[PDB]
Each structure stands twice: as C-alpha cells, then as structure tokens.
Design a protein around this ligand. Structure first.
Ligand SMILES: C[C@@H]1C[C@H]2O[C@@H]2CCCCC(=O)CC2C(Cl)C(=O)CC(=O)C2C(=O)O1
Length: 225
C-alpha cells in the first residue's frame, strides 16, 4: 500500500533555503509547528461556523506536545482540520498554494539582498521544513473529516504515504512526529520543551499542553498557554 514519492524540485530547493535561513536558530522549528497547529485549529473552527457536525470527530480545540526521550521522539499534535491523503501529498510534497510560489520568490530575493527571512517563513506558513534542522526523520499522521487516517514519512530524500493501519486514532487533526538527531537530544528534555512551548505560545488563541511529570511521579497535561 505504501506509495513512494519524490519531492518536487521547488520543494527540494525550498527546504534548503529554509534550512539555511534558520541554521543558527534551529529552535524556531517549534515556533513554526505551533503556528501551523494554530492555523489548522483556526480553520476547523471556521468550518464549524458552517458545518454543525464539524467537531464530531474530536470536540477539543487543542495543541498537545509530548516528549519520548526513551524513544527519541518529539510529538506535536493538534485537533485542527487535518489533511486528506491527497492534501498530505500536495501540501508536503509540492508547491501547493499559489502563495508558496510567492514565498519561494520572495525568499530567494530576500536571501540575496540580506533582508530578514524568518518572518517570510512564518508569513507563508512553510515552516514545516525547518523540522529537518533537528530531525533525521519527520512523520506526519493526519485525520480529516473527509478521509481516513494516513501517515506521511520522510528523511527529506523522498517521502511515502500509507493508510494508517492503526485506524482513526486522532479523531481529527494532525501529529508531527520528529525522530531527533543525536545533536538535538536536548529537545527531548521536558524543561527545554516547556520553556520553548511557553515562549512560542503566548500569542496563540488555543490552549497548548505538554505532557509533564512532577515526581511517586505525577504525569499530566500541563497548560503553557
Ligand atoms: C493544511 C492544514 C491547515 C492549514 O492552515 C494551516 C497551516 C499550515 C500548514 C502546513 C502544512 O503543510 C500541514 C500541517 C502541518 Cl506541517 C503542521 O505542522 C500541523 C498541521 O495541523 C497541518 C495541517 O493540517 O494544515
């Protein structure tokens, strides 16, 4: 069932521009993933204004982050609109929106003339690729109301998508799972993550939680705002 895809040339070029723009500020990948989560939540929220049963799959509007130090994984899960199988392929593997092309041109000129680029990344919502600054593999699990749950996975050299054999476990939404590089093990530390989530979530309009422990050890979702 697993279908293999090559990234579109432009996406390969875009990944490299992003990586180089944020190379000395890797922590920004988290800000971009939170921003993506927020936007996805805003979208399902707007859809609920016109579709009564829009939230049926998962009545919560949240962003939940968990570290799995013992598995070397960082998970960022939102209960936003999600993506159908076709949207996974299109959004992650091609220059989907008319605007991505715009970002690509603007990014190239800005990078050429020394103008700041981190803002452009956030403006066009193409920050996902910055996850490759800290991860050897990025996995995206998503569930949209119009489709079944699928998994997209990539080490940046190609990507594949398969129907999730685990069924509908998200309800609705998306999980970004990062298999962290050795040099990035710091992001597996709850304290580093909380501090970062807190620094990048005060502006978000949705509640953001991190699976944290107290220690007898108490494990639960801690609100960062
Ligand atoms: C297509 C929808 C909704 C859309 O408004 C957002 C903004 C940016 C999206 C960028 C993407 O490429 C897909 C998603 C990524 Cl990468 C995430 O980290 C979280 C997420 O929830 C995504 C999504 O489901 O996005």
């Amino acid at each position: 069932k697993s279908e293999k895809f090559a990234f579109q040339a432009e996406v390969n070029r875009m990944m490299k521009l992003i990586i180089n723009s944020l190379y000395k500020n890797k922590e920004i990948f988290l800000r971009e993933l939170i921003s993506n989560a927020s936007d996805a939540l805003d979208k399902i929220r707007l859809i609920s204004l016109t579709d009564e049963n829009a939230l049926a799959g998962n009545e919560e509007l949240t962003v939940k982050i968990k570290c799995d130090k013992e598995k070397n994984l960082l998970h960022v899960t939102d209960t936003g609109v999600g993506m159908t199988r076709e949207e996974l392929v299109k959004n992650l593997g091609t220059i989907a929106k008319s605007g991505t092309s715009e970002f690509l041109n603007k990014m190239t000129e800005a990078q050429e003339d020394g103008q700041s680029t981190s803002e452009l990344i956030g403006q066009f919502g193409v920050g996902f690729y910055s996850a490759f600054l800290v991860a050897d593999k990025v996995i995206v699990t998503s569930k949209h109301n119009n489709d079944t749950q699928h998994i997209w996975e990539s080490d940046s050299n190609e990507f594949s998508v398969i129907a999730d054999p685990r069924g509908n476990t998200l309800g609705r939404g998306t999980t970004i799972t990062l298999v962290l590089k050795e040099e990035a093990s710091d992001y597996l530390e709850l304290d580093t993550i909380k501090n970062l989530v807190k620094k990048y979530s005060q502006f978000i309009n949705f509640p953001i939680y991190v699976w944290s422990s107290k220690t007898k050890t108490v494990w639960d979702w801690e609100l960062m705002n």
